[PDB]
């Protein structure tokens, strides 16, 4: 379940998490609406956009 960061996001609302322009995360699991994705880097945990993201081998 290895993603890479698509865009920078700047985290802003409840436990969001920064994201960086290729960076590699882990996928925990998916808001209720699918719209936000949980994750976690060596940054922290989180939640970021789900279309910010995309597997990696």
């Known amino acids: 379940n290895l993603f890479v960061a698509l865009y920078d996001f ?4 409840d436990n969001t998490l920064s994201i960086t322009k290729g960076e590699k995360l882990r996928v925990l699991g ?14 922290g945990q989180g939640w970021v956009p789900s279309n910010y993201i995309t597997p990696v081998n």
């Open 30 to 43: 998916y808001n209720h609406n699918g719209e936000w994705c949980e994750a976690q880097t060596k940054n």
């Open 10 to 13: 700047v985290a802003s609302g």
